Amino acid sequence: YENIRDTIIERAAAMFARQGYSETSIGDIARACECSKSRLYHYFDSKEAVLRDMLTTHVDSLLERCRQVLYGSNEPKTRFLQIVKLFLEIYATSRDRHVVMLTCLDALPEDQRKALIAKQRELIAYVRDALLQLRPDMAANRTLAHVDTMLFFGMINWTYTWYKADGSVSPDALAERTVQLFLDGYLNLLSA
Amino acid sequence: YENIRDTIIERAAAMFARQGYSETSIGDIARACECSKSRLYHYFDSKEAVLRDMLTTHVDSLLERCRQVLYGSNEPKTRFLQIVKLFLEIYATSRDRHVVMLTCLDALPEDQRKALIAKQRELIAYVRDALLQLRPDMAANRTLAHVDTMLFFGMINWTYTWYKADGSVSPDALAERTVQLFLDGYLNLLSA
């Protein structure tokens, strides 16, 4: 039943993202959907199943949307900026599930953790490769290519701790700023 | 007793940083110091007291060391690079307590959370102000000054998720790279 399913997922995501996974019980979820503990197991076998599903659909979505961006523009600089705007858009729309991705992966077992870690590596690879399309002269040094990519991810992944998507600075404005800073540097940024 | 005190703190920091705060019990700590649950309360009143103390001494240390850096060099570009090298040095030496700062603040009540949040704001202020000493022309826009500062923090604070301080790239090398990228941009970075 694809309606009540997503309410559980929706309501669980919110709790896992405030108090966290170990803090949130199956009972907590049951009564957040204003429901009995029984009716949850009609859709999910475990608390881990709820988590595994929301993480899976979320990274799967991010990967597909990245691909559409990749397969769209001709120009490397445009594709890169579009990828960053996508990630921040997904924050603006899907903050809870985003935070849970960035925060809750360890709560899982080993096989599914690593299936999801594999998907996160795909996503990282897309960004790394798009950066090296801007600087093909830098592709020879894989060590520093990984460093530069992960420093970039830090800028955007840390946003959940401080950034409010309904504030003065829009997701698109933040993305443009992030790219101008990362590509061209704080010291060359035009001052209004 | 200032000897056994720090073992508790040391051993607790390690557990809070792997499995987390709610996951780690007072019993877990008692037996990590290969000890009875009684002897912990000789030094600490609560699990929260253990946490509050390690967070307090850690942010207090970071603040003092930042000040020594600030009061040292004449040149803004040097002071900024020295601040980043300091933060990454503290990761190389104090990873566990660092992760716990970046990760566990919410496990606390309200008054002490906000005393510590206030100290984190001081630290952020040091970095913001040092950036605006590089670009005084940008100090007029406080909104974007906060955005640029927090994007910077993301690069360095996200390191706990991916960076190994005993690897190919040293803490000082990572700091130099982070600063070159942030100040001068990915597109102007010299390629070996």
Residues B187/A135, Cβ–Cβ less than 8 Å? yes
Cα B127 vs. chain centroid, distance in angstroms? 13
**CATH number of the domain bearing residue A4:** 1.10.10.60
Q: From B134, B9, B18, select the one nearest B84 (Cα to Cα).
A: B134
A137/B191 Cβ within 8 A: yes
Chain B CB contacts of A147 under 8 Å are 169, 174, 177
Chain B closest CA to A22's CA: distance in Å? 7
B41 lies in the same domain as B64: no
CATH number reported for the structural domain that contains residue B153 in this entry: 1.10.357.10
Closest residue in A to B107 (Cα) is A19
> Per the CB < 8 Å rule, is A135 touching B20?
no
A/B interface, count of CB pairs below 8 Å:
125
Question: Would you say B127 and B70 are in contact if contact means Cβ atoms under 8 Å apart?
Answer: no
Q: Examine the domain organization and report whether B32 and B68 are in the same domain.
A: no
Q: What residue in B sits closest to A140 (Cα-Cα)?
A: B192
Residues A94, A177, single domain; the answer is: yes
Closest CA to B155 of B125, B129, B186, B122: B186
Question: What is the distance between the alpha carbons of residues A173 and A162, in angstroms, rounded to a whole number?
Answer: 15
Residues A40 and A61 in one domain: no
Q: Which residues contact B149 (CB under 8 A, 6 or more apart)?
A: B124, B127, B128, B131
Single-letter code of the amino acid located at A157: N
Instruction: For residues A137 and A192, state if they share a domain.
Output: yes
Residue B98, CA distances (Å) to A23, B62, B68, B89, B158 in order? 22, 10, 20, 11, 11
Task: Please list, in sequence order, all residues whose beta carbon lies within 8 angstroms of the beta carbon of residue B128, skipping any fewer than 6 positions away.
Answer: B145, B146, B149
The residue range of the domain holding A26 is 1-45
* Final residue before a domain boundary, out of B45, B63, B79: B45
Residue contact A183–B187, C-beta within 8 A:
yes
Please tell me which of the candidates A159, A187, A192 has its beta carbon nearest to residue B154.
A159
Determine, for residues A141 and B188 on separate chains, whether the beta-carbon distance falls below 8 Å.
no
Asked if A155 lies within 8 A of B155 by C-beta distance, the reply is yes
For residues A14 and A93, state if they share a domain: no
Which chain B residue lies closest to A186 (C-alpha atoms)? B183
User: What would the two tokens of residue B190 be?
Assistant: 């010299």
Phi, psi angle pair for A171, to nearest 5°:
-50, -45
- Residues A7, A60, single domain; the answer is no
Please indicate, yes or no, whether residues A32 and A62 belong to a single structural domain of this protein: no
Domain tally, chain B: 2
- Concatenated DSSP letters of B19-72: T-TTTS-HHHHHHHTT--STTTTTT-S-HHHHHHHHHHHHHHHHHHHHHHHHTT
Instruction: Please return the burial class of B189, using the count of CB atoms within 10 Å of its CB with bins 0-12, 13-18 and 19+.
Output: middle
Method: X-ray
B13 and B82, same domain (yes or no):
no
- Report CB contact under 8 Å: A150, B158: yes
Q: How far is A152 from chain B (nearest CA, A)?
A: 6
Q: Are residues A62 and A157 in the same domain?
A: yes
Report the gap between the CA of B2 and the closest CA in chain A (Å).
33
Output phi, psi for B20, to 5 deg: 100, 175
Distances (CA, A) of A53 to A34, A100, A112, A117: 21, 12, 10, 14
A101 and A127 inside one domain: yes
Tell me which chain A residues have a C-beta less than 8 angstroms from the C-beta of B105. Answer: none
Residues B51 and B14 in one domain: no
Tokens standing for A117?
Answer: 């870690």
Annotated resolution, angstroms: 2.0
- Residue in chain B nearest A157 by alpha carbon: B154
